[PDB]
Amino acid sequence: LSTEATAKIVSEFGRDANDTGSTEVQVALLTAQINHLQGHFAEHKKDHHSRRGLLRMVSQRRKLLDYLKRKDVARYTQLIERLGLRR
Amino acid sequence: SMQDPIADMLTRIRNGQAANKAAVTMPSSKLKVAIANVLKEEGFIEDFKVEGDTKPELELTLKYFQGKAVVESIQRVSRPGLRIYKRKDELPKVMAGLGIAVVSTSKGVMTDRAARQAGLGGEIICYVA
RNA sequence: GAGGGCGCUUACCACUUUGUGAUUCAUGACUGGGGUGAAGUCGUAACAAGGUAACCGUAGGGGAACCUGCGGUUGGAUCA
RNA sequence: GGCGUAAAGCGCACGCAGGCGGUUUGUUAAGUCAGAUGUGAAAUCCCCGGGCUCAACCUGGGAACUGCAUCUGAUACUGGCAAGCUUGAGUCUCGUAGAGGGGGGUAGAAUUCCAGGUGUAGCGGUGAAAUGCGUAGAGAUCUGGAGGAAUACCGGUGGCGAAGGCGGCCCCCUGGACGAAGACUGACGCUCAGGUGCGAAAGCGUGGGGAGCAAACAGGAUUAGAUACCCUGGUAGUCCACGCCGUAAACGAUGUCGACUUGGAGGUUGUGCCCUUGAGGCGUGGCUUCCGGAGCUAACGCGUUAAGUCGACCGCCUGGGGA
RNA sequence: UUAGCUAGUAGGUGGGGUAACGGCUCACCUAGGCGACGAUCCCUAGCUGGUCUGAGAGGAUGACCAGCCACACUGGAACU
RNA sequence: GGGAGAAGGCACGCUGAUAUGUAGGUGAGGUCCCUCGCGGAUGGAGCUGAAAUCAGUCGAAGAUACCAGCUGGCUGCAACUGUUUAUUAAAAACACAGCACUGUGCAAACACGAAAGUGGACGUAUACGGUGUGACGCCUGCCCGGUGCCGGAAGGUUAAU
Ligand SMILES: [Mg+2]
Ligand SMILES: [Mg+2]
Ligand SMILES: [Mg+2]
Ligand SMILES: [Mg+2]
Ligand SMILES: [Mg+2]
Ligand SMILES: [Mg+2]
Ligand SMILES: [Mg+2]
Ligand SMILES: [Mg+2]
Ligand SMILES: [Mg+2]
Ligand SMILES: [Mg+2]
Ligand SMILES: [Mg+2]
Ligand SMILES: [Mg+2]
Ligand SMILES: [Mg+2]
Ligand SMILES: [Mg+2]
Ligand SMILES: [Mg+2]
Ligand SMILES: [Mg+2]
Ligand SMILES: [Mg+2]
Ligand SMILES: [Mg+2]
Ligand SMILES: [Mg+2]
Ligand SMILES: [Mg+2]
Ligand SMILES: [Mg+2]
Ligand SMILES: [Mg+2]
Ligand SMILES: [Mg+2]
Ligand SMILES: [Mg+2]
Ligand SMILES: [Mg+2]
Ligand SMILES: [Mg+2]
Ligand SMILES: [Mg+2]
Ligand SMILES: [Mg+2]
Ligand SMILES: [Mg+2]
Ligand SMILES: [Mg+2]
Ligand SMILES: [Mg+2]
Ligand SMILES: [Mg+2]
Ligand SMILES: [Mg+2]
Ligand SMILES: [Mg+2]
Ligand SMILES: [Mg+2]
Ligand SMILES: [Mg+2]
Ligand SMILES: [Mg+2]
Ligand SMILES: [Mg+2]
Ligand SMILES: [Mg+2]
Ligand SMILES: [Mg+2]
Ligand SMILES: [Mg+2]
Ligand SMILES: [Mg+2]
Ligand SMILES: [Mg+2]
Ligand SMILES: [Mg+2]
Ligand SMILES: [Mg+2]
Ligand SMILES: [Mg+2]
Ligand SMILES: [Mg+2]
Ligand SMILES: [Mg+2]
Ligand SMILES: [Mg+2]
Ligand SMILES: [Mg+2]
Ligand SMILES: [Mg+2]
Ligand SMILES: [Mg+2]
Ligand SMILES: [Mg+2]
């Protein structure tokens, strides 16, 4: 992804606006790339070698978001509402 | 991954002895300090030494006699897949008295001979034969 | 007079009856294959480079071993 | 007990439940251990003993009755719970390498077909021939087309991908890996029954295309016969888009992850330093092929990418056929 | 090579009943409960202290003896 | 999707209670607003009104009359709904969606007409005519000697001129 977009992402979700490694930040970067890449997998439908990378991104987002749900329930609920994931 | 730090320690001792090392090294921990303390007490290593401020490296200096290794065999008993907790009459006696068996009892970690002389069982971590 | 008994009746329920499945055993002309048999008939596919290297999958064919197509494997032989 | 070759590692990955879980402190004390209490009917089994003259048998006392529950403790391990760490796992910054995937263009060589010119009697074929193509002028040959497919040399046990696989060049979209100094989150980890996704070729459906090649089929031979090899043709199919099938000697006949253990030879792709003092030299990573040590192994052989020493989780085998 | 099962079924409130709690039995309501830690279904079986074997962990089994359960020609029902 | 209304069985009248007519439907008043009228909210009188459960009772028989499936099993033929021999044949015949072959490049092929023209079509190869077959599943094997049809114009024979 582009450097201005990731700088936007860490500025809108960051702890100290430098850290780039927090769980909210990693889920925000993952969801930005997933909702950008759905447009690729709507026009190219036989693109399985990148569809696997999308499935990796999905599973990794789900692992981080489950760790957030175990860690802070209030932070997880406000984060899933701020992003716009369903569950 | 590192699903058994104690078997990492024991496998490092067995490998270093069977491959003729002198000073083997591993990352430290409290149970590793206790087991290496038992081994230095009974005489299966020369001396151990834990060096490092935040995360340390535990170093074991292996013994030898006429070139051959000192620990003949060493194995796990209570692996994490299947733990072995033993009462006091059902304690082992490895190598008919010669070898030692390390037991964690309520009074810290101690050789099974001391566990029999203190009258309580525990968990058998290893069979240093 | 109360109350009782018998009797009638309703409720429940067994034997019995019909209808229709499910499972299991027996049996059934004929048939798909399998196994064993006395010097039976037709071949000779495999083991050596087994005389077309075999084999795996799949499809077609053919008296039968099998043959050929497409892809794969070395568990294939010769290296002056 | 076992899984390279004897029967046995799912084709490969994702992943819910489940199983296991780095390290420091504090608490709890569930698992664990220890004492006591209740209890484990008696008979039997066992240890000492008594009797039937001996034994079998009868019988006294005892432990055992490997358990269950309750009370009381202990706190090393495991668990819960609460706070921390940073090595595990991951994110950012900047590049490098790549036939990784998907879509669209395009280039030349060659084969075939057509059209036209030359020019004449052979072409094609195998072991040797023939069917076939030829006096309607072929094969050879020069020009102009048209068409479809595959990409010579690079090209190398080279690279990339999880596996299948991927090979001219260009663009668009895109995944992954790896390296460097930093920074950051702070156990977020590993494996995974069922479940899902990808999965060569052949095959099927719908619709296109159709040059080569080519199962089926026809003809020619060889043959004892030859439903085969060999020859001349030749339709499916190969190809493009959508789907379906889910199989292979899907092979490294070696599940994944992680740790430790003598070396050498190369290749590949970074990167640090040193005077790159010329096409050097001193190290650290990742990936990869060959030889080989102890170890192991039934032997062959594998051998820091293990079939060595181990740990976690999963799959599978129990004589050959029948199958 | 049995993945769905269950309508008094899971629970509630009220009534009745029982030596006694309880859907034990009814009225009404809620729509539940059981299930891959194997429900439901099929086949076999009395269970246990023990006995035989085994070095032991186990495997097989339940004769006599002793405890418990069930049945008394088959299927029911109640009385004392 | 179907089979299927498979088969097979139970309840069915009147009266009383729940409820002196229930749930539901309709909404008069009345009250408040009211962008003021054929306006809108609680408001439910009156009117209508199933259907169910419990109890009673009658008859031999409660859908009591009229109207109102015979059901099941195996199989042939045809996929089906359709159409025909008006007036002895309604089918297993005809059609049919689908399949294939073939013709046709548009002033189409083809037909009706000496001809103009028109249908084809105010359509343009995913269209139209003709032919055979008759959904869907598995399939369609061998022969070009005969008769056709298509390609050849080198040669033999060949008309008017
Ligand atoms: Mg990532
Ligand atoms: Mg042979
Ligand atoms: Mg031969
Ligand atoms: Mg052969
Ligand atoms: Mg052969
Ligand atoms: Mg061979
Ligand atoms: Mg053939
Ligand atoms: Mg074995
Ligand atoms: Mg074999
Ligand atoms: Mg094998
Ligand atoms: Mg494998
Ligand atoms: Mg995995
Ligand atoms: Mg732990
Ligand atoms: Mg406790
Ligand atoms: Mg007893
Ligand atoms: Mg005696
Ligand atoms: Mg604890
Ligand atoms: Mg740091
Ligand atoms: Mg931190
Ligand atoms: Mg699975
Ligand atoms: Mg294919
Ligand atoms: Mg096809
Ligand atoms: Mg076919
Ligand atoms: Mg086709
Ligand atoms: Mg062709
Ligand atoms: Mg297989
Ligand atoms: Mg392969
Ligand atoms: Mg291979
Ligand atoms: Mg295999
Ligand atoms: Mg071994
Ligand atoms: Mg080697
Ligand atoms: Mg191993
Ligand atoms: Mg082996
Ligand atoms: Mg009650
Ligand atoms: Mg009561
Ligand atoms: Mg034994
Ligand atoms: Mg009785
Ligand atoms: Mg009786
Ligand atoms: Mg007949
Ligand atoms: Mg009909
Ligand atoms: Mg009809
Ligand atoms: Mg008509
Ligand atoms: Mg008629
Ligand atoms: Mg008519
Ligand atoms: Mg008629
Ligand atoms: Mg016209
Ligand atoms: Mg017909
Ligand atoms: Mg017909
Ligand atoms: Mg035919
Ligand atoms: Mg003909
Ligand atoms: Mg002819
Ligand atoms: Mg023909
Ligand atoms: Mg002609």
Tab-separated table of C-alpha atoms (C1' of nucleotides) in Angstrom, chain A residues 1-3 6 18-23 25-26 29 33 36-37 40 43-57 59-60 63-64 67 70-71, chain D residues 13-16 81 83 90-94 100-103 161-164 172-177 183-190 197-199 241-243:
chain	number	residue	atom	x	y	z
A	1	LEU	CA	0.000	0.000	0.000
A	2	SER	CA	1.039	3.629	-0.501
A	3	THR	CA	3.070	5.495	2.095
A	6	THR	CA	-0.371	4.090	5.727
A	18	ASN	CA	4.677	6.833	15.464
A	19	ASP	CA	4.405	3.289	16.792
A	20	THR	CA	2.927	1.553	13.668
A	21	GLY	CA	2.668	-1.761	15.503
A	22	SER	CA	-0.360	-1.525	17.774
A	23	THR	CA	-3.214	-3.991	17.383
A	25	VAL	CA	-3.151	-0.166	13.731
A	26	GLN	CA	-2.546	-3.649	12.337
A	29	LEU	CA	-3.999	-1.644	7.834
A	33	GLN	CA	-5.995	-3.520	2.171
A	36	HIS	CA	-9.141	-2.151	-1.408
A	37	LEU	CA	-8.464	-5.641	-2.796
A	40	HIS	CA	-9.404	-6.685	-7.653
A	43	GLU	CA	-12.939	-7.993	-11.912
A	44	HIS	CA	-10.310	-10.749	-11.934
A	45	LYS	CA	-12.071	-13.808	-10.585
A	46	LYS	CA	-9.496	-16.480	-11.453
A	47	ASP	CA	-6.703	-14.865	-9.451
A	48	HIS	CA	-6.106	-17.605	-6.939
A	49	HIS	CA	-2.442	-16.942	-6.152
A	50	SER	CA	-3.425	-13.574	-4.702
A	51	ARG	CA	-6.729	-14.863	-3.342
A	52	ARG	CA	-4.618	-16.935	-0.962
A	53	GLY	CA	-2.837	-13.791	0.225
A	54	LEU	CA	-6.227	-12.207	0.825
A	55	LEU	CA	-7.271	-15.247	2.878
A	56	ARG	CA	-4.061	-14.894	4.878
A	57	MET	CA	-4.854	-11.220	5.536
A	59	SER	CA	-7.243	-14.855	9.055
A	60	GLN	CA	-4.561	-12.582	10.509
A	63	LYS	CA	-6.546	-13.457	15.057
A	64	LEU	CA	-5.589	-9.912	16.069
A	67	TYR	CA	-6.805	-11.060	20.830
A	70	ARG	CA	-9.786	-11.155	24.910
A	71	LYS	CA	-7.716	-8.155	26.025
D	13	A	C1'	-2.858	-25.115	2.204
D	14	C	C1'	-6.452	-22.075	5.439
D	15	G	C1'	-9.069	-22.864	9.842
D	16	C	C1'	-13.589	-23.310	14.094
D	81	C	C1'	-6.740	-14.598	38.078
D	83	A	C1'	0.102	-6.820	36.802
D	90	G	C1'	3.397	-9.749	13.752
D	91	U	C1'	3.310	-4.232	11.832
D	92	C	C1'	5.943	0.128	9.592
D	93	U	C1'	10.564	2.534	6.640
D	94	C	C1'	13.923	1.325	1.977
D	100	G	C1'	4.397	-16.439	-8.889
D	101	G	C1'	-0.980	-15.288	-10.505
D	102	G	C1'	-4.976	-12.521	-13.437
D	103	G	C1'	-6.348	-9.342	-17.943
D	161	G	C1'	4.986	-20.586	-5.740
D	162	A	C1'	2.010	-23.790	-0.065
D	163	A	C1'	0.951	-28.098	-3.775
D	164	G	C1'	-0.542	-28.613	-9.007
D	172	C	C1'	-2.382	-2.714	-16.172
D	173	C	C1'	-3.912	-5.057	-11.435
D	174	U	C1'	-1.590	-8.196	-7.418
D	175	G	C1'	0.122	-11.740	-3.758
D	176	G	C1'	4.383	-13.721	-1.349
D	177	A	C1'	9.698	-14.013	0.148
D	183	A	C1'	10.982	1.813	15.864
D	184	C	C1'	6.595	-0.656	17.703
D	185	U	C1'	2.376	-4.292	19.753
D	186	G	C1'	3.701	-7.384	23.930
D	187	A	C1'	2.157	-14.514	24.077
D	188	C	C1'	-1.428	-12.062	19.925
D	189	G	C1'	1.907	-18.913	19.433
D	190	C	C1'	1.984	-24.162	17.142
D	197	G	C1'	-10.539	-23.407	-0.760
D	198	C	C1'	-6.853	-24.487	-4.606
D	199	G	C1'	-5.791	-29.104	-7.229
D	241	A	C1'	-14.439	-18.023	-21.951
D	242	C	C1'	-17.878	-20.159	-18.421
D	243	G	C1'	-18.694	-24.107	-15.432
